[PDB]
Amino acid sequence: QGTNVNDKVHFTNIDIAIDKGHVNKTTGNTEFWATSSDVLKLKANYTIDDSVKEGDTFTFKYGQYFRPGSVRLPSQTQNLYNAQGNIIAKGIYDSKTNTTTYTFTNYVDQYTNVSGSFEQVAFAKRENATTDKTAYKMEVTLGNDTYSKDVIVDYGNQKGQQLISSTNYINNEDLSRNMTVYVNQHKKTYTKETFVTNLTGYKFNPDAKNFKIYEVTDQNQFVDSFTPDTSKLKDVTGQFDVIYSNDNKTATVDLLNGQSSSDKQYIIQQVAYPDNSSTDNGKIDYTLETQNGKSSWSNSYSNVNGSSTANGDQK
Amino acid sequence: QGTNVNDKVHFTNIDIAIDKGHVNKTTGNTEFWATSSDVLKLKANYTIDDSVKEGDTFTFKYGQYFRPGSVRLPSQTQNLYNAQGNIIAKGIYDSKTNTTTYTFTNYVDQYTNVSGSFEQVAFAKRENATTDKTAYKMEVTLGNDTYSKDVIVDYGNQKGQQLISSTNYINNEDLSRNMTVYVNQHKKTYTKETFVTNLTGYKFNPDAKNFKIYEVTDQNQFVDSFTPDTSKLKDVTGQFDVIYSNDNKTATVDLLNGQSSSDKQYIIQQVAYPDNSSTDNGKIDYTLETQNGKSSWSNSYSNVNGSSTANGDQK
Ligand SMILES: [Mg+2]
Ligand SMILES: [Mg+2]
């Protein structure tokens, strides 16, 4: 009962593809533009040996640079279906081990000569696949069958920009946007440095204590993937006053923080929660006001479903 | 009751954008590649005059070349929401008049100073926006506020191909693929002409009488949009023998049809139904076997969700 049957579930035609992929003007390669709506697609065929029984298990093990999901983190639930639309294997995905463990239903005792296929949306493990225009080996083991493919990733980090942001990830359970903002990558000096975030369709939760400010101590902390390793970083959150306003849709912080000038470099992380469950569409707008003027970077969320919103004053 | 309040619902910042759009390498323009996953996005802000009351109506009227929806036809249901996630206007889209009529709830009596916005996925009206690399004026009237934007469409009709297919539309209610296949656009002569369709993840319904063969009598009838006008066409369906096999996943037709040779040109339409409701992913493969060898064209469906299937022999 619970027997591991990795050796009895046989995968063929394993493939990782970039969907849709962006062709690099100069090199001619198709790349994975992770911040331009590309995803990875993992596909395979499989057969199940007849001796497999109800409750037998098998695993999908994903590698260092590869995981299921998209910008949105994968569900803990991962199921496989039959052509009738019924679940035949119930899977639990563990992020810590980057592994899904599937358990067969009674389908495998009710049916013989089973063959199937799947297609799964997949992505870079951003905390490891860190750097723009760099090939990373995307690896997976389905049962005991291994496959790998090199994928060139680009996240578009423009290291000359004084303000640049990206979605780090979307939470699968609450659809919150988990943001990463890079301030001062090019190491200028400022004598005014007001950082404002304005949310459309989202709100901050100040009580959740998830607006975090890290002082960079090494340029290589700014990973191109916008998924820095917050355990390497200097947390200075408590030194700053983050002021909320506009129904928790605006956050303002004086990054000078009582100094007359600063050449400090920052990684800022934030969590923005959709207004309601009818949509997660919206926009997050960043501005940085310095002595030289204002820089801006925005992040828009517009799905293929459409949406609408409205507000008014109750009488 | 039921007062038309088009004059009392005011739209601003109306926009139609191509999402994502494709840049034409030669011309430099951003184009709507309708068969390469682009859609249109209609956006606007609005305000509601306070005198509007429950049951008051307003329209969105779409133009000759523009409609809501995507490759998938729009729902008859079109709602507007507030930031709490509640419906504030219940809409009915009529394809015949290309108009949505919205009815306000009691939100517009219980609230004052209402403003809002929407974002709607939209598309070409393919029966009218027929031709590749052609600008079509995409027009809409929201209330009494009109807007238009020229959009260059491309469907990728390669007129030199002896066989080419496209999705005409996806049915919104049953997710069927409604396909258009062009045979012999360049008008060659054949002495073998076997046309086969193979479905993966879909089945034909032979009983439904929706596999149609039209004999082209004017090159113009091949519209690049793959949405020909079947009223201008010569229906020859009943002359041909369409042979179903492989669990209604394969259809085979001898297009020579008892002649020794043929230079006829054909438009073929078909309807392919998903195996189940858990997904509509899958593929349709077409081949044409002539004296010269075999031509093939395929259409794949791979959503951002993932899917899986399987089949076996019930014990
Ligand atoms: Mg068995
Ligand atoms: Mg009113």
- For chain A, the domains span 9-154, 163-301
Q: How far apart are CA B42 and CA B39, in angstroms?
A: 10
Distance CA(B169)–CA(B167), nearest Å, equals 5
CA angle, B32 then B33 then B39, to 5°: 65
Under 8 Å between Cβ of A70 and A36: no
Distance A106 CA to ligand 1 centre (A): 8
Q: Tokens at residue A100, please?
A: 């899904």
Q: Which ligand sits nearest to residue B105's alpha carbon?
A: 2
Which residues 90-129 on chain A approach chain B with CB closer than 8 angstroms?
107, 110-121
Contact residues, chain B, for A83 at CB < 8 Å: 275-276, 309-311
Annotated binding site of A: 50, 52, 108
Pair B43, B122: CB distance under 8 Å: no
Q: Is the dihedral of CA B235, B239, B245, B250 positive or negative?
A: negative
Determine phi and psi for B110, rounding to 5 degrees: -85, -20
* Bridge partners, residue B267, by sequence: B182, B214
Contact between B117 and B46 under an 8 Å Cβ cutoff? The reply is yes
The H-or-E segment that residue B298 falls in is strand B293-301
Q: Are A198 and A264 a contacting pair, CB within 8 Å? A: no
Q: What does DSSP say about strands B30-33 and B145-154: parallel, antiparallel, or unpaired?
A: parallel
Q: In whole angstroms, give the CA distance from residue A90 to residue A19.
A: 26
Q: Within an 8 Å CB–CB cutoff, is residue A70 touching chain B?
A: yes
Instruction: Please report residues of A whose CB lies closer than 8 A to that of B300.
Output: none
Kindly give the distance from the C-alpha atom of residue B112 to the centroid of ligand 2, in angstroms, as a whole number.
6
List the single residue in B309, B312, B314 with the smallest CB-CB distance to A117. Answer: B309
* Distance in angstroms (rounded) separating the CA atoms of residues A2 and A94: 18
> For residue B37, with 0-12 CB atoms within 10 Å meaning exposed, 13-18 middle and 19 or more buried, which class applies?
middle
Distance CA B164, CA A170 (A): 39
Question: Helix (H, G, I), strand (E, B), or coil: what is residue B173?
Answer: coil
Cis peptide before A20 (omega within 30 of 0): yes
Which candidate in B309, B313, B314 is best for mutational testing of the A interface (most A CBs within 10 A)? B309
Rg over CA atoms, chain B: 23
Record: contact A85-B117, CB cut-off 8 A: no
Q: For residue A281, which residues of chain B lie inside 8 Å, CB to CB?
A: 119
Q: Residues of B forming the annotated binding site for Mg(2+)?
A: 50, 52, 108
Residue of B nearest to A118 (CA): B308
- CATH architecture for segment(s) A163-301: Sandwich (2.60)
State the distance between the two ends of chain A, measured CA to CA, in whole angstroms: 63
Picking from B39, B41, B111, the nearest residue to A312 by CB comes out as B111
- Is B163-301 in the same CATH topology as B9-154? yes
Which of A39, A82, A305 is closest, CB to CB, to B311? A82
Interface of A with B in 142-171 (CB under 8 A): none
Min Cα distance A71 → chain B (Å) is 11
Resolution in A: 1.5
Nearest-angstrom CA–CA distance, B190 and A200: 60
Contacts of B142 in chain A (CB under 8 A): none
Find tokens 């400022």 and name the residue.
A190
Strands B111-124 and B66-68: antiparallel
The rounded distance, in Å, linking the Cα atoms of A293 and B50 is 40
Strands B57-62 and B39-48 turn out to be unpaired
Terminus-to-terminus CA distance in chain B, angstroms? 63
Give me the residues of B, 278-307, that contact A with CB < 8 A: 278-279, 281, 302, 304-307
Determine, for residues B307 and A118 on separate chains, whether the beta-carbon distance falls below 8 Å: yes
Instruction: Compute and round to an integer the Cα radius of gyration of chain A.
Output: 23
- Could you give the CA distance from residue B269 to residue A251 in angstroms, rounded to a whole number? 56
- Cβ within 8 Å, pair A276-B115: no
Distance of CA B79 to the CA centre of its chain: 21
Distance CA A19, CA A33 (A): 10
Q: Which residues of B touch A39 (CB under 8 A)?
A: 304
What is the DSSP annotation of chain A?
---B-GGGEEEEEEEEEEES-EE-TTT--EEEETTTT-EEEEEEEEEE-TT--TT-EEEEEE-TTEEESSSBPPPSEEEEE-TTS-EEEEEEEETTTTEEEEEE-THHHHEEEEEEEEEEEEEE-TTTS-STTEEEEEEEEETTEEEEEEEEEE----TT-SEEEEEEEE-TTT--EEEEEEE-TT---BS-EEEEEEEESEE--GGG---EEEE-SSGGGS-TTS---TTSSEE-GGGS-EEEETTTTEEEEETTTT-S-B---EEEEEEEEES-TT---EEEEEEEEETTEEEEEEEEE--SS-EEEEEEEE-
Please give the distance, rounded to the nearest whole angstrom, from the Cα atom of residue A6 to the centre of ligand 2.
64
CB atoms within 10 A of CB B70: 21
Instruction: Tell me the nearest-neighbour CA distance from A258 into chain B, angstroms.
Output: 38
CATH no. of B9-154: 2.60.40.1280
Look up residue B144 and give its two tokens.
Answer: 């009494």
Our measurement of the distance from residue B276's CA atom to the centroid of its chain's CA atoms, rounded to an integer in Å, reads 21
